[PDB]
Amino acid sequence: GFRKMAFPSGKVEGCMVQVTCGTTTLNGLWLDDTVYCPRHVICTAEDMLNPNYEDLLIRKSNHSFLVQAGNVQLRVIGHSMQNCLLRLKVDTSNPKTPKYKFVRIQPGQTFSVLACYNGSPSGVYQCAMRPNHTIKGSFLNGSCGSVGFNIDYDCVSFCYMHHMELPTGVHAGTDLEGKFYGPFVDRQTAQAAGTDTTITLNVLAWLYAAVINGDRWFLNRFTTTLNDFNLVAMKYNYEPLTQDHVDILGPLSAQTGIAVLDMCAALKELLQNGMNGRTILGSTILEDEFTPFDVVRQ
Amino acid sequence: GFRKMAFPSGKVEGCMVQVTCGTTTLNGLWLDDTVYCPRHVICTAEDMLNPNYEDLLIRKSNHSFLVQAGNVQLRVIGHSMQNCLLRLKVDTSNPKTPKYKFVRIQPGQTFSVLACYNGSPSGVYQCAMRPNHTIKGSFLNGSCGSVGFNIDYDCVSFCYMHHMELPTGVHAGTDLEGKFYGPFVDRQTAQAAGTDTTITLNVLAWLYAAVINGDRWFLNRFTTTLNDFNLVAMKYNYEPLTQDHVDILGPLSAQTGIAVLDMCAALKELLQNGMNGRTILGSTILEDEFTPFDVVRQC
Ligand SMILES: CC(C)(C)[C@H](NC(=O)C(F)(F)F)C(=O)N1C[C@H]2[C@@H]([C@H]1C(=O)N[C@H](C=N)C[C@@H]1CCNC1=O)C2(C)C
Ligand SMILES: CC(C)(C)[C@H](NC(=O)C(F)(F)F)C(=O)N1C[C@H]2[C@@H]([C@H]1C(=O)N[C@H](C=N)C[C@@H]1CCNC1=O)C2(C)C
Structure with a gap:
């Protein structure tokens, strides 16, 4: 009678959407009239060696973002970059938006993850921010944009959005202001974490x-x-x-x-x-x- | 990278309610105009060895059942007993009812549990039905009526409603037709899990x-x-x-x-x-x- 327990994920499930640019698809978080997603959705195998995201974003229009909230397509009426996220403005405000905060969690703290694929939630599990600023998650292809969160009372505290898997099989991502945890950059190149320790x-x-x-x-x-x-x-x-x-x-x-x-x-x-x-x-x-x-x- | 993962719980969260009979409160599952909950909600130290559930049920009016979906009270319009569950008809059909079915989970298969207290979900985790028909859960006082479930595409398959804890710390309950898994009974009496075996x-x-x-x-x-x-x-x-x-x-x-x-x-x-x-x-x-x-x- 003691096990890893995740928070109930319903408040977060109602915020998950699918964001597509050309052939690249991942998940976005829809809060009020904003969709947050990893910025490498605008990349196409220039993921490697030289993502110049400012150069790649200036060449995009609102029309190049296909955002799908289930069956319905939301129209992008604006976009800006913040650190390693895009903030997409859409004409519709999410009626399911919970009371929420964006927080940056400290190493050793735990959160629940809602793993999503094609905008659609598929599993929920508990994990922790490691001292070396990676997380030991379960993320497959198409999971970028999945979020980590805690719930206090009725308020969802979003703390993580997923970006990448390191060669050791651990994961790295950002807070909901788009700043990475740890020394990592969103470029498809070999990157190592510092040596981890036990909490x-x-x-x-x-x-x-x-x-x-x-x-x-x-x-x-x-x-x-x-x-x-x-x-x-x-x-x-x-x-x-x-x-x-x-x-x-x-x-x-x-x-x-x-x-x-x-x-x-x-x-x-x-x-x-x-x-x-x-x-x-x-x-x-x-x-x-x-x-x-x-x-x-x- | 292998770890136990639960199904997203939102589709079940919107069905969870609180059911109260006098001094005893527990959770119920509100689908359409039916609320399902363990029948021992009608007990009051009649839990001891010998509740006569047919006797206790005939002595209860609809108005004795206080059913609350969060903020709002739901009016109980009728009630029947199905095995070890009550079915409470209410005047309101749950607008959040998902596509669902009721399945009987088999030993060895897994499911997610949404642990709830006073009708409010508090945590989600995954469970296996053991060969000896218990589950190794995490249930405190007030957890009865919490459900276990799987989700295929958009359809919730309900398979478990929590009723009791056995002395070895494992848990017993029923399917959503009220039939117990295992040889257990909802009576506060000497009961023990059989010898477990490994899946x-x-x-x-x-x-x-x-x-x-x-x-x-x-x-x-x-x-x-x-x-x-x-x-x-x-x-x-x-x-x-x-x-x-x-x-x-x-x-x-x-x-x-x-x-x-x-x-x-x-x-x-x-x-x-x-x-x-x-x-x-x-x-x-x-x-x-x-x-x-x-x-x-x-993989
Ligand atoms: C694992 C891979 C070798 C492909 C690469 N890793 C490194 O380049 C590193 F070595 F720097 F980490 C990597 O993750 N990406 C390459 C590219 C993004 C990202 C990516 O594909 N994100 C996925 C989002 N849907 C989730 C991943 C996929 C598999 N399992 C996950 O969690 C960007 C850094 C822009
Ligand atoms: C553990 C206790 C000794 C109290 C007893 N157990 C046995 O009588 C046995 F040993 F026979 F199992 C027992 O569980 N109950 C006594 C009584 C019901 C039930 C009960 O209180 N259910 C709780 C529902 N809210 C959830 C439980 C509480 C603690 N942790 C749980 O999961 C009925 C069988 C009608």
Whole structure:
């Protein structure tokens, strides 16, 4: 009784459309009278080596954008570029527009992804912004324009739009202002991320999830200092723990009766001695894509 | 890049309502002018061992059922009992009703669950119907009436309505005709899941996914017949493979060039010799809720 859960996607499904330029098709996000989509929709195998997007956009008209909201075609009455997105103005305002915000998420935070193909939603899953600013998604051909989001009350916080897959199989994209997460550019050329690390704050939160759910085999009577634990974190490619992070784990610490630095001693033991064929919440690996907030909500 | 993915939940979100009888509230599924919900909504510590549902139902008027679709109350116009569900006729037909059907999901097949509380959807996740007819869900108090479903093209196939949690932490419920999956009853009494077994068709799909992903340390050159693999599998509480299962794995065997029965011989050795601390797709435990359809669609 503890698993990856995505937000219900209906508020986002009502905003998904299909945007086509010539032979290139991807998904767009339709909010009020604006459609947001990745700008490389205007590209045709000049995806490579030299996308000069200013040169390629000046040569386009409104008429060269075919935007389809289901059966209906919306007419583009304007267009501008913002960073790596296009903002297409259309004559119709989406009646299904939810209360929404655009936010830029921090590494370690999680969001739900609505994977779309030809404007049509096909799956929903949870994932996280990695410390190296990639995401470990599931995106196939035609998935560009799919969005990541969180929902607070009735408000959809859009945080990700999908652009590309790196050769390691992880993914890269932008916020809804079109600025990439990480060092990447929307050009079909080989690009690497920085070396990733494990999200220590999330592993600790998931260890609290396990205690809350009856898995306590890994606890122990020892404890450790912050710097003592951080020395072990660095050896195993975990990111350092901050007093602010300890402060974030306060509510989970209270509800379980295990001080943060005690859980760190437990984690230190799991890194050093392995898990010895046992499981935690049904997993044989230390899970790092649940935030403290995700654990409390579940 | 393989991961569990749920169907987009919007088509079901627009059908979720709250149903309240006195002190007990749970979720209902509003399609056209019918609201479907577990019948134990009419109970009040009559839940204990022996609710007499026909007795409790005859003693209830339409006005005792408080049905709320978000902001607005819906008026219950009639009601009947179908197996372990109530069917509430309301005066309003749901304008958001999608194309739908009611299906009986089979052991081994997967579906998405929209977990709801007080008629408000809170999360979506994917589930397998286990061979012992339970599901390994994530349901808290108030989750009853949450539904599981698949979506084909534009049509929602409803297959599950949540009723209860068994002592091992797994969950039981019914199809949308109110017939329970498994030998369970909606009575708060001593009940236990049967012995689970492992969904072998899905473990084999997972090994194929691992081969597609470049991991093939577990392959060997032994051969096995279907019958000799099934005899070993049952010794380890694995489901035996059927004729149809071998056919279902055709696409993945063709894609990888590994004959179905050769992957069976790979699995047979894993069952008999363990993993010896090696990992498959990052895990020392064989996943059995990822279907051959999920592997095929995610490649
Ligand atoms: C994977 C590929 C080698 C093709 C390339 N990657 C690199 O060039 C890199 F090495 F720089 F990453 C790449 O993704 N693109 C090439 C080109 C865009 C993009 C693209 O096709 N986006 C798809 C949108 N529908 C979603 C992708 C497709 C497959 N799975 C996804 O997620 C732009 C960078 C303009
Ligand atoms: C777990 C409990 C000991 C309470 C009991 N279980 C057994 O009696 C068993 F052990 F027999 F299964 C049980 O579930 N119920 C008691 C009673 C219904 C049901 C119930 O409360 N359903 C909840 C619906 N809102 C969802 C559950 C709650 C907690 N987590 C869930 O999923 C009925 C069988 C009429």
